[PDB]
Amino acid sequence: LAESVTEVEIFGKATSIDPNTYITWIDKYQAQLVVLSAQIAWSENVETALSSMGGGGDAAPLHSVLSNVEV
């Protein structure tokens, strides 16, 4: 779980994910671990975006997180 989270953090902090690396990462780890790592990455991403949005809607990273989810 620690290793897969370390990998999926690097995956999340990026745009235009290369299919090959994503497939290799999925094959490397177990189903529960890959799902849980995706969940952890999204949770910490949203927490960081909300923390950076203390003042208000100005400069909101949530659009970046949502776009990453779409990619």
- Type of residue found at 53: M
Resolution of the PDB structure in angstroms: 3.4
Q: Write down the experimental method used for this entry.
A: cryo-EM
- Contact criterion met (CB below 8 Å) for 60 and 49: yes
Rounded-to-integer distance, Cα 42 and Cα 21, Å: 19
3: which 2 tokens?
């290793």
Which tokens in the block code for residue 1? Answer: 């779980």
CA distance 3 to 28: 10
Q: Which amino acid is at 19?
A: P
- Nearest alpha carbon to residue 8 among 24, 25, 20: 25
